[PDB]
Design an enzyme around this catalytic site. Structure first.
Site, mmCIF file in Angstrom:
data_model
loop_
_atom_site.group_PDB
_atom_site.id
_atom_site.type_symbol
_atom_site.label_atom_id
_atom_site.label_comp_id
_atom_site.label_asym_id
_atom_site.label_seq_id
_atom_site.Cartn_x
_atom_site.Cartn_y
_atom_site.Cartn_z
ATOM 1 C CG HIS A 147 24.250 18.113 2.180
ATOM 2 N ND1 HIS A 147 25.633 18.221 2.136
ATOM 3 C CD2 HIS A 147 23.725 18.898 1.208
ATOM 4 C CE1 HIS A 147 25.904 19.066 1.148
ATOM 5 N NE2 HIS A 147 24.792 19.489 0.547
ATOM 6 C CG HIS A 171 20.286 21.682 3.304
ATOM 7 N ND1 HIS A 171 20.575 22.949 2.809
ATOM 8 C CD2 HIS A 171 20.290 20.804 2.275
ATOM 9 C CE1 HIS A 171 20.735 22.795 1.506
ATOM 10 N NE2 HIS A 171 20.599 21.521 1.139
ATOM 11 C CG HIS A 176 17.059 19.143 -2.049
ATOM 12 N ND1 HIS A 176 16.613 19.665 -0.869
ATOM 13 C CD2 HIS A 176 18.359 19.473 -2.214
ATOM 14 C CE1 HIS A 176 17.637 20.320 -0.358
ATOM 15 N NE2 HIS A 176 18.720 20.206 -1.126
ATOM 16 C CG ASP A 177 20.690 17.521 -0.162
ATOM 17 O OD1 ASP A 177 21.237 17.006 -1.167
ATOM 18 O OD2 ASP A 177 20.864 18.701 0.169
ATOM 19 C CG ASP A 226 20.697 22.796 -2.924
ATOM 20 O OD1 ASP A 226 20.658 22.555 -1.695
ATOM 21 O OD2 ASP A 226 21.315 22.095 -3.728
ATOM 22 C CD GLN A 267 31.819 31.019 1.994
ATOM 23 O OE1 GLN A 267 30.685 31.451 1.793
ATOM 24 N NE2 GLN A 267 32.083 29.729 1.919
#
Ligand SMILES: [Mg+2]
Ligand SMILES: [Zn+2]
Length: 320
Positions: A79, A83, A117-118, A228, A280
Protein backbone atom coordinates in the site's frame (compact mmCIF):
# COMPACT_ATOMS: atom_id res chain seq x y z
CA UNK A 1 0.97 17.02 10.03
CA UNK A 2 1.03 16.59 6.22
CA UNK A 3 4.39 16.46 4.46
CA UNK A 4 5.41 18.99 1.88
CA UNK A 5 7.36 18.49 -1.31
CA UNK A 6 10.43 20.67 -2.11
CA UNK A 7 10.54 23.33 -4.82
CA UNK A 8 13.17 21.24 -6.62
CA UNK A 9 10.70 18.31 -6.57
CA UNK A 10 7.66 20.05 -8.09
CA UNK A 11 9.74 22.16 -10.50
CA UNK A 12 11.36 18.94 -11.73
CA UNK A 13 7.90 17.55 -12.45
CA UNK A 14 6.87 20.71 -14.36
CA UNK A 15 9.78 20.18 -16.82
CA UNK A 16 9.19 16.41 -17.20
CA UNK A 17 8.20 15.21 -20.70
CA UNK A 18 6.74 11.76 -21.38
CA UNK A 19 8.64 9.67 -23.96
CA UNK A 20 6.60 9.28 -27.20
CA UNK A 21 6.88 5.45 -27.09
CA UNK A 22 4.78 5.32 -23.87
CA UNK A 23 1.96 7.55 -25.17
CA UNK A 24 0.45 4.60 -27.03
CA UNK A 25 1.12 2.06 -24.23
CA UNK A 26 -0.41 4.14 -21.39
CA UNK A 27 -3.85 3.92 -23.08
CA UNK A 28 -3.91 0.14 -22.62
CA UNK A 29 -5.56 -1.50 -19.67
CA UNK A 30 -2.71 -3.97 -19.17
CA UNK A 31 -0.01 -1.25 -19.08
CA UNK A 32 2.46 -1.84 -16.17
CA UNK A 33 4.03 1.36 -14.70
CA UNK A 34 6.58 -0.87 -12.87
CA UNK A 35 9.70 -0.20 -14.97
CA UNK A 36 9.29 3.60 -15.06
CA UNK A 37 9.59 4.70 -11.44
CA UNK A 38 11.20 8.10 -12.19
CA UNK A 39 8.26 8.82 -14.54
CA UNK A 40 5.37 8.03 -12.13
CA UNK A 41 4.54 11.64 -11.14
CA UNK A 42 4.82 12.68 -14.81
CA UNK A 43 2.63 9.79 -15.94
CA UNK A 44 -0.06 11.11 -13.58
CA UNK A 45 0.30 14.66 -14.96
CA UNK A 46 0.04 13.26 -18.49
CA UNK A 47 -3.16 11.29 -17.57
CA UNK A 48 -4.79 14.33 -15.93
CA UNK A 49 -3.95 16.46 -18.98
CA UNK A 50 -5.27 13.88 -21.46
CA UNK A 51 -8.47 13.17 -19.48
CA UNK A 52 -9.23 16.64 -18.06
CA UNK A 53 -7.29 18.97 -20.38
CA UNK A 54 -3.94 20.81 -20.07
CA UNK A 55 -5.70 23.86 -18.53
CA UNK A 56 -7.96 21.97 -16.07
CA UNK A 57 -5.58 22.63 -13.19
CA UNK A 58 -2.88 25.29 -12.68
CA UNK A 59 0.27 23.31 -13.52
CA UNK A 60 2.25 24.63 -10.54
CA UNK A 61 -0.47 23.68 -7.98
CA UNK A 62 -0.96 20.25 -9.62
CA UNK A 63 2.80 19.47 -9.43
CA UNK A 64 3.00 20.54 -5.77
CA UNK A 65 -0.06 18.46 -4.96
CA UNK A 66 1.34 15.35 -6.69
CA UNK A 67 4.80 15.51 -5.12
CA UNK A 68 3.34 16.08 -1.64
CA UNK A 69 0.92 13.11 -2.12
CA UNK A 70 3.96 10.97 -3.01
CA UNK A 71 5.66 12.14 0.19
CA UNK A 72 2.64 11.08 2.27
CA UNK A 73 2.77 7.40 1.20
CA UNK A 74 4.89 5.12 3.39
CA UNK A 75 7.63 2.62 2.55
CA UNK A 76 5.31 -0.40 3.11
CA UNK A 77 5.54 -3.44 0.72
CA UNK A 78 2.17 -2.98 -1.03
CA UNK A 79 0.00 0.00 0.00
CA UNK A 80 2.57 2.52 -1.27
CA UNK A 81 3.15 5.20 -3.98
CA UNK A 82 3.45 2.59 -6.75
CA UNK A 83 0.02 1.14 -5.85
CA UNK A 84 -1.49 4.68 -5.89
CA UNK A 85 -0.21 5.40 -9.45
CA UNK A 86 -1.22 1.88 -10.67
CA UNK A 87 -4.80 2.42 -9.37
CA UNK A 88 -4.90 5.95 -10.95
CA UNK A 89 -3.70 4.51 -14.28
CA UNK A 90 -6.51 1.89 -14.29
CA UNK A 91 -9.01 4.72 -13.61
CA UNK A 92 -7.56 6.70 -16.51
CA UNK A 93 -7.96 3.70 -18.86
CA UNK A 94 -11.59 3.20 -17.69
CA UNK A 95 -12.40 6.91 -18.10
CA UNK A 96 -10.74 7.14 -21.56
CA UNK A 97 -12.83 4.25 -22.81
CA UNK A 98 -16.11 5.63 -21.37
CA UNK A 99 -15.26 9.36 -21.57
CA UNK A 100 -18.66 11.02 -22.13
CA UNK A 101 -20.45 8.93 -19.47
CA UNK A 102 -18.59 10.99 -16.83
CA UNK A 103 -18.66 14.71 -16.04
CA UNK A 104 -15.48 16.81 -16.10
CA UNK A 105 -15.90 17.16 -12.31
CA UNK A 106 -16.12 13.37 -11.89
CA UNK A 107 -13.02 12.75 -14.02
CA UNK A 108 -10.94 15.20 -11.99
CA UNK A 109 -12.31 13.88 -8.72
CA UNK A 110 -11.78 10.19 -9.56
CA UNK A 111 -8.21 10.50 -10.83
CA UNK A 112 -7.35 12.49 -7.67
CA UNK A 113 -9.25 10.04 -5.38
CA UNK A 114 -7.28 7.14 -6.91
CA UNK A 115 -3.92 8.81 -6.34
CA UNK A 116 -4.93 9.52 -2.72
CA UNK A 117 -6.97 6.42 -1.90
CA UNK A 118 -4.38 4.72 0.39
CA UNK A 119 -2.63 7.90 1.75
CA UNK A 120 -0.48 7.17 4.87
CA UNK A 121 -1.35 3.46 4.97
CA UNK A 122 0.69 1.73 7.69
CA UNK A 123 0.61 -1.80 6.25
CA UNK A 124 -2.05 -2.96 8.71
CA UNK A 125 -5.64 -4.06 7.91
CA UNK A 126 -8.85 -2.62 9.44
CA UNK A 127 -9.18 -6.06 11.17
CA UNK A 128 -5.80 -5.52 12.93
CA UNK A 129 -6.43 -1.90 13.93
CA UNK A 130 -9.81 -2.75 15.46
CA UNK A 131 -8.62 -6.01 17.15
CA UNK A 132 -5.74 -4.17 18.87
CA UNK A 133 -7.60 -0.88 19.64
CA UNK A 134 -5.35 1.43 17.60
CA UNK A 135 -6.19 5.18 18.04
CA UNK A 136 -7.46 5.24 14.43
CA UNK A 137 -10.13 2.60 15.25
CA UNK A 138 -11.42 4.83 18.07
CA UNK A 139 -11.62 7.88 15.73
CA UNK A 140 -13.09 5.89 12.83
CA UNK A 141 -15.44 3.08 13.99
CA UNK A 142 -15.92 1.58 10.47
CA UNK A 143 -13.91 1.77 7.17
CA UNK A 144 -11.07 2.87 9.54
CA UNK A 145 -8.16 3.32 7.14
CA UNK A 146 -10.41 4.69 4.35
CA UNK A 147 -11.78 7.51 6.56
CA UNK A 148 -8.14 8.26 7.42
CA UNK A 149 -7.08 8.30 3.72
CA UNK A 150 -9.76 10.89 2.97
CA UNK A 151 -8.73 12.96 6.01
CA UNK A 152 -5.14 12.95 4.65
CA UNK A 153 -6.39 14.02 1.18
CA UNK A 154 -8.15 17.06 2.64
CA UNK A 155 -5.00 17.87 4.71
CA UNK A 156 -2.88 18.02 1.51
CA UNK A 157 -5.36 20.26 -0.34
CA UNK A 158 -5.17 22.64 2.69
CA UNK A 159 -1.35 23.09 2.26
CA UNK A 160 -0.14 26.44 0.87
CA UNK A 161 -0.46 26.46 -2.96
CA UNK A 162 -1.74 22.83 -3.04
CA UNK A 163 -5.46 23.45 -3.51
CA UNK A 164 -5.95 22.34 -7.13
CA UNK A 165 -9.73 22.78 -6.65
CA UNK A 166 -9.64 26.54 -5.66
CA UNK A 167 -10.89 27.66 -9.11
CA UNK A 168 -14.11 25.61 -8.75
CA UNK A 169 -17.35 27.36 -7.76
CA UNK A 170 -18.28 26.83 -4.06
CA UNK A 171 -20.98 24.35 -5.29
CA UNK A 172 -18.60 22.36 -7.55
CA UNK A 173 -15.93 22.36 -4.81
CA UNK A 174 -18.29 20.67 -2.31
CA UNK A 175 -19.41 18.29 -5.10
CA UNK A 176 -15.85 17.18 -5.94
CA UNK A 177 -14.95 16.56 -2.29
CA UNK A 178 -18.06 14.34 -2.04
CA UNK A 179 -17.08 12.42 -5.15
CA UNK A 180 -13.61 11.89 -3.61
CA UNK A 181 -14.92 10.94 -0.16
CA UNK A 182 -17.39 8.39 -1.55
CA UNK A 183 -14.79 7.00 -3.99
CA UNK A 184 -12.14 6.53 -1.21
CA UNK A 185 -14.70 5.02 1.25
CA UNK A 186 -15.75 2.61 -1.54
CA UNK A 187 -12.18 1.11 -1.57
CA UNK A 188 -13.05 -0.66 1.74
CA UNK A 189 -13.53 -4.19 0.25
CA UNK A 190 -16.05 -4.94 3.08
CA UNK A 191 -18.46 -2.51 1.24
CA UNK A 192 -17.77 -3.97 -2.23
CA UNK A 193 -19.86 -7.13 -1.69
CA UNK A 194 -23.10 -5.28 -1.04
CA UNK A 195 -22.44 -2.76 -3.77
CA UNK A 196 -21.77 -5.47 -6.41
CA UNK A 197 -24.83 -7.50 -5.37
CA UNK A 198 -27.05 -4.38 -5.67
CA UNK A 199 -25.60 -3.35 -9.01
CA UNK A 200 -26.02 -6.86 -10.46
CA UNK A 201 -29.72 -6.77 -9.44
CA UNK A 202 -30.28 -3.26 -10.93
CA UNK A 203 -28.56 -4.30 -14.13
CA UNK A 204 -30.42 -7.57 -14.55
CA UNK A 205 -33.88 -6.03 -13.81
CA UNK A 206 -33.04 -3.14 -16.12
CA UNK A 207 -33.60 -0.55 -13.34
CA UNK A 208 -30.00 0.75 -13.58
CA UNK A 209 -30.13 4.47 -14.42
CA UNK A 210 -26.91 6.53 -14.65
CA UNK A 211 -28.88 9.84 -14.37
CA UNK A 212 -29.87 8.67 -10.84
CA UNK A 213 -27.15 9.97 -8.46
CA UNK A 214 -27.41 7.01 -6.05
CA UNK A 215 -26.90 4.64 -9.06
CA UNK A 216 -23.88 6.69 -10.29
CA UNK A 217 -22.36 6.49 -6.77
CA UNK A 218 -22.64 2.69 -6.87
CA UNK A 219 -21.11 2.44 -10.42
CA UNK A 220 -18.27 4.74 -9.33
CA UNK A 221 -17.80 2.55 -6.21
CA UNK A 222 -17.44 -0.59 -8.39
CA UNK A 223 -14.98 1.28 -10.67
CA UNK A 224 -12.95 2.04 -7.49
CA UNK A 225 -12.84 -1.68 -6.56
CA UNK A 226 -11.91 -2.60 -10.13
CA UNK A 227 -9.00 -0.10 -10.05
CA UNK A 228 -7.88 -1.03 -6.57
CA UNK A 229 -7.63 -4.75 -7.56
CA UNK A 230 -6.17 -4.18 -11.06
CA UNK A 231 -2.91 -6.08 -10.39
CA UNK A 232 -5.07 -9.15 -11.30
CA UNK A 233 -5.58 -7.62 -14.78
CA UNK A 234 -1.92 -7.27 -15.77
CA UNK A 235 0.33 -9.69 -17.70
CA UNK A 236 0.93 -12.82 -15.57
CA UNK A 237 4.59 -12.01 -14.51
CA UNK A 238 3.40 -8.58 -13.29
CA UNK A 239 0.41 -10.13 -11.43
CA UNK A 240 2.73 -12.71 -9.83
CA UNK A 241 5.31 -10.07 -8.70
CA UNK A 242 2.55 -7.89 -7.19
CA UNK A 243 1.13 -10.87 -5.26
CA UNK A 244 4.63 -11.17 -3.68
CA UNK A 245 4.35 -7.58 -2.35
CA UNK A 246 0.77 -8.13 -1.17
CA UNK A 247 1.82 -11.22 0.80
CA UNK A 248 5.03 -9.64 2.14
CA UNK A 249 2.76 -6.96 3.75
CA UNK A 250 0.19 -9.55 4.95
CA UNK A 251 2.87 -11.86 6.44
CA UNK A 252 4.38 -8.90 8.38
CA UNK A 253 0.90 -8.29 9.91
CA UNK A 254 0.63 -12.04 10.66
CA UNK A 255 4.04 -11.89 12.41
CA UNK A 256 2.80 -9.10 14.70
CA UNK A 257 -0.34 -11.10 15.52
CA UNK A 258 1.79 -14.10 16.62
CA UNK A 259 3.70 -11.77 19.01
CA UNK A 260 0.33 -10.79 20.54
CA UNK A 261 -0.49 -14.49 20.99
CA UNK A 262 -3.06 -14.70 18.15
CA UNK A 263 -2.73 -17.25 15.34
CA UNK A 264 -3.17 -15.29 12.07
CA UNK A 265 -5.60 -16.16 9.30
CA UNK A 266 -3.95 -18.41 6.66
CA UNK A 267 -3.53 -15.55 4.17
CA UNK A 268 -1.34 -13.67 6.71
CA UNK A 269 0.65 -16.79 7.79
CA UNK A 270 4.12 -17.04 6.21
CA UNK A 271 4.17 -20.72 7.22
CA UNK A 272 1.20 -21.38 4.87
CA UNK A 273 2.79 -20.34 1.53
CA UNK A 274 2.04 -23.63 -0.20
CA UNK A 275 -1.67 -22.83 0.16
CA UNK A 276 -1.26 -19.46 -1.74
CA UNK A 277 -2.37 -20.77 -5.17
CA UNK A 278 -5.67 -22.09 -3.75
CA UNK A 279 -6.08 -18.81 -1.84
CA UNK A 280 -5.65 -16.85 -5.05
CA UNK A 281 -8.10 -19.11 -6.96
CA UNK A 282 -10.65 -18.51 -4.19
CA UNK A 283 -10.19 -14.72 -4.33
CA UNK A 284 -10.56 -14.63 -8.14
CA UNK A 285 -13.76 -16.70 -8.01
CA UNK A 286 -15.35 -14.84 -5.12
CA UNK A 287 -14.10 -11.26 -5.63
CA UNK A 288 -12.15 -10.45 -8.80
CA UNK A 289 -14.17 -12.24 -11.48
CA UNK A 290 -17.59 -11.02 -10.14
CA UNK A 291 -16.20 -7.47 -9.90
CA UNK A 292 -14.97 -7.27 -13.49
CA UNK A 293 -18.03 -9.22 -14.72
CA UNK A 294 -20.46 -6.69 -13.34
CA UNK A 295 -18.21 -3.78 -14.43
CA UNK A 296 -18.15 -5.19 -18.01
CA UNK A 297 -21.96 -5.50 -18.07
CA UNK A 298 -22.32 -1.83 -17.01
CA UNK A 299 -19.36 -0.46 -19.03
CA UNK A 300 -18.77 -2.77 -22.05
CA UNK A 301 -15.43 -1.08 -23.07
CA UNK A 302 -13.91 -2.39 -19.76
CA UNK A 303 -14.09 -6.00 -21.12
CA UNK A 304 -10.24 -6.20 -21.47
CA UNK A 305 -9.99 -6.12 -17.63
CA UNK A 306 -12.29 -9.15 -17.34
CA UNK A 307 -10.39 -11.02 -20.13
CA UNK A 308 -7.03 -10.37 -18.37
CA UNK A 309 -8.47 -11.40 -14.97
CA UNK A 310 -9.77 -14.66 -16.54
CA UNK A 311 -6.33 -15.37 -18.10
CA UNK A 312 -4.71 -14.95 -14.67
CA UNK A 313 -7.30 -17.20 -13.06
CA UNK A 314 -6.24 -19.88 -15.61
CA UNK A 315 -2.60 -19.21 -14.60
CA UNK A 316 -3.33 -19.85 -10.91
CA UNK A 317 -5.14 -23.06 -11.95
CA UNK A 318 -1.94 -24.11 -13.84
CA UNK A 319 0.02 -23.49 -10.61
CA UNK A 320 -2.35 -25.80 -8.69
MG1 LIG B 1 -7.12 0.75 0.97
ZN1 LIG C 1 -5.62 0.37 -2.45
Amino acid sequence: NASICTSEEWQGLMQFTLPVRLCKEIELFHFDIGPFENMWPGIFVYMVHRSCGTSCFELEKLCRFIMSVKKNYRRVPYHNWKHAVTVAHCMYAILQNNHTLFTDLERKGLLIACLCHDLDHRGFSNSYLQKFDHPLAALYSTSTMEQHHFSQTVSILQLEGHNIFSTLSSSEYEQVLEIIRKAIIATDLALYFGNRKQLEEMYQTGSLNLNNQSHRDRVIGLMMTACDLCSVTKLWPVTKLTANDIYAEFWAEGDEMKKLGIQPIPMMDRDKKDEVPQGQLGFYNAVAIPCYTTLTQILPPTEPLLKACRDNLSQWEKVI
